[PDB]
């Protein structure tokens, strides 16, 4: 079912470029393209490039996101799917969006990731539900902290 690694941080991104680390594995210790990263609690981030001797990931806390990460939220019985599609850098809230369906979905309700499209590897923890948006929309806050990520887990699908 599932590849784990385990790789250090080595490189951090420019103040104000795309928000994303480097590992020290790449694809000579089994990193792929279609694997997620865990750090820290949870979640941190969805790898954007492989080499042969180390990764780059993307990290979570980029204002935009276009990677359509699958994440499943859970609310008693009923799972509701969809993307991750932004962070909100101010409020420290991740951006769940193309929600799959119109029922309840309330504060401290479990987001896991889902396993579908190209990231897929369900089940990882993302955080817990904050509010829902409409101006429809989900803020959830991360269980991953932010600050200090040293040691990454890559994580895909066999």
Same mark, same amino acid.
């Given at each position: 079912?599932?590849?784990?690694?385990?790789?250090?941080?080595?490189?951090?991104?420019?103040?104000?470029?795309?928000?994303?680390?480097?590992?020290?594995?790449?694809?000579?210790?089994?990193?792929?393209?279609?694997?997620?990263?865990?750090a820290n609690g949870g979640l941190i981030?969805?790898? &954007?490039?492989?080499?042969? #001797? +180390?990764? %780059?990931?993307?990290?979570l806390t980029? $204002?935009?996101?276009?990677?359509?990460?699958?994440?499943?939220?859970?609310?008693?019985?009923?799972?509701?799917?969809?993307?991750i599609?932004?962070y909100?850098?101010?409020?420290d809230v991740l951006?769940? &969006?193309?929600?799959?369906? #119109? +029922?309840? %979905?309330?504060?401290?309700?479990?987001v $896991?990731?889902?396993?579908?499209?190209?990231?897929?590897?369900?089940?990882?923890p993302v955080g817990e539900?904050v509010?829902?948006?409409?101006?429809?929309?989900?803020?959830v806050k991360l269980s991953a902290d932010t600050?200090?990520?040293?040691?990454?887990?890559?994580?895909?699908?066999?």
């Amino acid at each position: 079912a599932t590849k784990t690694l385990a790789a250090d941080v080595i490189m951090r991104s420019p103040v104000s470029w795309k928000q994303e680390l480097t590992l020290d594995a790449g694809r000579s210790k089994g990193a792929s393209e279609n694997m997620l990263a865990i750090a820290n609690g949870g979640l941190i981030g969805s790898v &954007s490039k492989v080499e042969e #001797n +180390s990764t %780059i990931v993307n990290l979570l806390t980029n $204002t935009e996101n276009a990677d359509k990460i699958s994440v499943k939220i859970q609310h008693g019985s009923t799972t509701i799917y969809g993307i991750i599609i932004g962070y909100d850098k101010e409020n420290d809230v991740l951006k769940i &969006s193309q929600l799959n369906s #119109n +029922s309840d %979905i309330s504060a401290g309700d479990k987001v $896991t990731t889902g396993g579908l499209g190209n990231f897929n590897v369900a089940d990882i923890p993302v955080g817990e539900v904050v509010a829902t948006t409409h101006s429809r929309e989900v803020t959830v806050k991360l269980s991953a902290d932010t600050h200090n990520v040293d040691v990454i887990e890559l994580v895909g699908n066999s």
